[PDB]
Paper text:
ID30B is an undulator-based high-intensity, energy-tuneable (6.0–20 keV) and variable-focus (20–200 µm in diameter) macromolecular crystallography (MX) beamline at the ESRF. It was the last of the ESRF Structural Biology Group’s beamlines to be constructed and commissioned as part of the ESRF’s Phase I Upgrade Program and has been in user operation since June 2015. Since its first commissioning experiments, ID30B has proved to be a versatile MX beamline that expands the experimental capabilities of the JSBG beamline portfolio at the ESRF. ESRF beamline ID30B has been in full user operation, including remote access, since June 2015 and, at the time of writing, data collected at the beamline has resulted in 83 PDB depositions and 62 publications.
To further illustrate the capabilities of the beamline, several single-wavelength anomalous diffraction (SAD) experimental phasing measurements were carried out on three test proteins. Diffraction data from a single flash-frozen crystal were collected at 100 K using an X-ray beam size of 30 µm2 with a flux of 2.3 × 1011 photons s−1 at the peak of the Zn K absorption edge (λ = 1.282 Å). Next, a seleno­methione-derivative of the feruloyl esterase module of xylanase 10B from Clostridium thermocellum (FAE) was crystallized and cryoprotected as previously described. Diffraction data from a single flash-frozen crystal were collected at 100 K using an X-ray beam size of 30 µm2 with a flux of 3.3 × 1011 photons s−1 at the peak of the Se K absorption edge (λ = 0.9792 Å). All three structures were then refined using the PDB_redo server and model building carried out in Coot. A summary of all crystallographic information is shown in Table 3.
Numbering used by the authors: 803 to 1085
Write the structure that this text describes.
């Protein structure tokens, strides 16, 4: 029974959500070959996953020095939080994918190209998303059911995905990372605006839920960028995505550590994928 709030506040998951849930989603290790050579990712399927149904899909990127196994390892345990939240009805069932920017010519900045060409067709040909095909026209037609997020260097990845993939992705979750593209915060905001202009999309067709900690170094460059974005007509600031499309959650006292950042995903992910959803829900 999720309901939108207009200014949602930081709230960690209870400590019991960090322990294994008996209603556990299956995690599948996959290997594929793309423009950056042979690489792996993990796919989280919700408990009761039925491939005759269609699922929203969220792709989630690791930070510097990490890999495609980090988010579901003992150092993070995001699957436990997902399992609990789905079981208790706080979060609608979805597929969550944890890829990597490691390998070949791949960098956090350039990952969007591999994302487009290899990762979406590989994953969404095998698993049941709202994509009816994985041609560019099929991917673009299911964009309201696709999201991208990430932490630190994976937050940087998210910003480059947004500016190059608005045709394919409607929901964005940059966590503790800023957009390195321009010599001022206004250059950053203007580049995002120009990408939106080129896409032809209305303000009801893209959504940005950013977050960091008040004690995370990422705040220093994120906050000026967010302020420059708020001044654009392209963004209506509120966490009530029935009305607007842009929010920045700052967790008091939180440091640059997955121990906190996993809770940002707990807070924000329930806000995604309801606008023009195919179920009859009152939020």
């Amino acid at each position: 029974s999720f309901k939108y709030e207009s200014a949602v506040q930081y709230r960690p998951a209870p400590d019991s959500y960090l322990n294994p849930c008996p209603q556990a989603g299956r995690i599948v290790k996959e290997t594929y070959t793309g423009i950056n050579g042979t690489k792996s990712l993990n796919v989280y399927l919700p408990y009761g996953y039925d491939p005759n149904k269609k699922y929203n899909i969220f792709y989630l990127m690791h930070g510097g020095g990490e890999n495609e196994n980090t988010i579901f390892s003992n150092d993070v345990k995001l699957q436990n939080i997902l399992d609990h939240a789905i079981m208790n009805g706080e979060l609608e069932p979805l597929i969550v994918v944890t890829p990597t920017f490691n390998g070949g010519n791949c960098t956090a900045q350039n990952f969007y190209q591999e994302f487009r060409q290899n990762v979406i067709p590989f994953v969404e040909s095998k698993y049941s998303t709202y994509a009816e095909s994985t041609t560019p026209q099929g991917i673009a037609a299911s964009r309201m059911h696709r999201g991208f997020g990430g932490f630190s260097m994976g937050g940087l990845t998210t910003w480059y995905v947004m500016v190059n993939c608005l045709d394919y992705v409607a929901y964005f979750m940059p966590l503790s990372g800023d957009y390195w593209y321009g010599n001022s915060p206004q250059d950053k905001a203007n580049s995002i605006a120009e990408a939106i202009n080129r896409s032809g999309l209305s303000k009801r067709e893209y959504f940005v839920f950013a977050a960091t900690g008040s004690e995370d170094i990422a705040y220093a460059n994120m906050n000026p960028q967010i302020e420059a974005m708020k001044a654009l007509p392209h963004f209506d600031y509120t966490s009530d995505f029935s009305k607007g499309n842009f929010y920045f959650l700052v967790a008091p006292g939180a440091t640059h550590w997955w121990g906190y950042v996993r809770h940002y995903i707990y807070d924000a992910l329930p806000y995604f994928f309801h606008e023009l959803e195919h179920h009859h829900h009152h939020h």
